[PDB]
Ligand binder design. Structure first.
Ligand SMILES: NC(=O)c1ccc[n+]([C@@H]2O[C@H](COP(=O)([O-])OP(=O)(O)OC[C@H]3O[C@@H](n4cnc5c(N)ncnc54)[C@H](O)[C@@H]3O)[C@@H](O)[C@H]2O)c1
Ligand SMILES: C[C@@H](CCC(=O)O)C(=O)O
Ligand SMILES: C[C@@H](CCC(=O)O)C(=O)O
Lengths: 291, 290
């Protein structure tokens, strides 16, 4: 149903997400403290406001799409008292599980409904409205939120209680990072063995080793012409963002006392690579295994 | 139609040879274990006291043996007994270096030779669904194809000699890494209060998906048939995975390659095989706190 939505954070993800909500007939009230972000969002039909409290004042739903837990926490502290009681808050930022539960609790103590709904699919998913939302919180609250999320989404998955969205995401992305390094390692070893890249591709993809890091993101040019390796390692999914998600994985590991040997090794590998190659697709880590 | 000498009639070699008999081949056999040889003779293999005798009348000689050293020693023991242009197929899993050496040895005797290691285990072997990954010439593979077919679900030409070994060892190194990574994720999810079923639904629907989770799920429930629901009965044993990883490490050393994650997995599984060699390799989920 047609709803008034405050959208806080109108950057690379926020702006195309808000555009799709405008497209779907929603009244969208935006705030972003970077005026260039606000401007682009305004051009696609977002009513932009001077302050986050103002955007929130007349909203049935408040979406945050923000860079860090700290920024989300700060935003919530600024805006929750300005919101009408029992407003629905959706945080679609990617933040630590700890941060997520903290801000969830904060929202509920102000009388607001709240979900964590971080997304995968990147800017291209965002623009095409094919993002996967991975949701933590009450089933009934998600029920309410569904018609707001659908115009932005390819998939909506209920993961469990508050924080389970962030948890599911960060677990997947840790696995992914490990797979991307492992695939790169196999391709270089193959090369040193005289096994052709095409041959190795055909085998792994036909065998138990198959995974998106090879079938879609193949780190050598040729076998999958759409993969970033064929395009100077243009993201795609940048090393900067993978390194962020791995930091959040390591936060979760630290918070739980879990043991994740390879997840953590992959974290240290991507952190070193991020220093000088933050801008390249995460499949570019193959470069560290050659010469 | 064809006479085949089958050298190595063990857990894999016995059922593979039974399938060859089943497809109308004359199978001649050798194994140093009487129990293996006897079982094989029970399903139609003519068992001989030595490998050179088994080889004498054969058009094709298949090896299924435990190490490159044994394969090399077999070749040097039988090559003079073979007729010229006999087709040698090594379906042992040995190092790429060993494969190429024995390939060159065989061809120097005017024989034709392939490396064709297999995936699928005893189960696959008995069911005739093994995946053969082949190195050697395409024309030689073509000539071999009617022998491989009755043992095989899948036959892939990987490249020149050694490429079959190479492809297998590279896939299994990745598999080992995946199996550990998936296990990490399940125990992480559990400590975060994320249910095993929710994690499973997400990963299988997302970029992290792989066989290690969709078929070998290391926690019981999401995949009722996975070894986790059956006391981690193999499946694919830790002993065997540890074997393949040893071979990956030889290949890494031999080439001077950088394989930090593959190597780390190799370390983990080598440790784990000291205590739980007989369990499915997905059981590694319960050795993360070591
Ligand atoms: N490929 C991707 O871009 C991708 C994919 C999935 C998830 N994510 C995650 O999405 C989140 C944001 O993505 P993005 O690309 O839009 O980030 P971005 O950094 O491009 O934009 C963040 C925006 O938030 C604004 N902001 C900061 N403080 C604010 C406040 N108090 N109120 C309102 N706005 C504020 C900033 O000015 C900026 O425009 C991150 O948590 C990121 O890790 C990104
Ligand atoms: C993703 C959502 C439908 C919305 C859409 O396709 O934009 C659903 O299937 O739950
Ligand atoms: C030719 C066939 C193998 C025959 C078999 O199924 O046993 C295949 O390549 O799949």
């Amino acid at each position: 149903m047609m709803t008034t939505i405050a959208f806080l954070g109108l950057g690379n993800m926020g702006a195309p997400m808000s555009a799709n909500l405008v497209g779907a007939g929603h009244v969208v009230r935006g705030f972003d403290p970077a005026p260039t972000a606000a401007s682009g969002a305004a051009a696609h039909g977002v009513a932009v406001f001077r302050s986050a409290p103002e955007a929130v004042a007349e909203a049935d739903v408040v979406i945050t799409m923000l860079p860090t837990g700290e920024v989300v926490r700060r935003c919530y502290t600024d805006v929750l008292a300005a919101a009408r009681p029992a407003t629905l808050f959706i945080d679609s930022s990617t933040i630590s599980v700890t941060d997520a539960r903290e801000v969830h609790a904060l929202a509920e103590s102000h009388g607001m409904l709240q979900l964590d709904a971080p997304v995968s699919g990147g800017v291209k998913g965002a623009a095409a409205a094919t993002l996967a939302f991975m949701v933590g919180g009450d089933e009934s609250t998600l029920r309410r939120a569904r018609p707001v999320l659908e115009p932005m989404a390819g998939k909506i998955i209920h993961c469990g209680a508050a924080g389970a969205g962030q948890a599911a995401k960060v677990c997947n992305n840790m696995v992914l990072a490990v797979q991307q390094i492992a695939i790169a390692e196999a391709f270089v070893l193959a090369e040193k063995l005289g096994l052709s890249a095409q041959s190795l591709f055909d085998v792994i993809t036909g065998a138990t080793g198959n995974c998106w890091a090879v079938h879609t993101n193949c780190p050598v040019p040729g076998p999958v012409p759409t993969s970033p390796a064929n395009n100077d390692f243009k993201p795609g999914f940048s090393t900067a963002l993978m390194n962020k998600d791995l930091g959040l994985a390591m936060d979760a590991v630290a918070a739980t006392g879990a043991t994740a040997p390879l997840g953590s090794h992959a974290a240290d590998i991507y952190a070193k690579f991020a220093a000088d190659h933050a801008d390249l697709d995460f499949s570019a880590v193959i470069h560290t295994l050659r010469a």
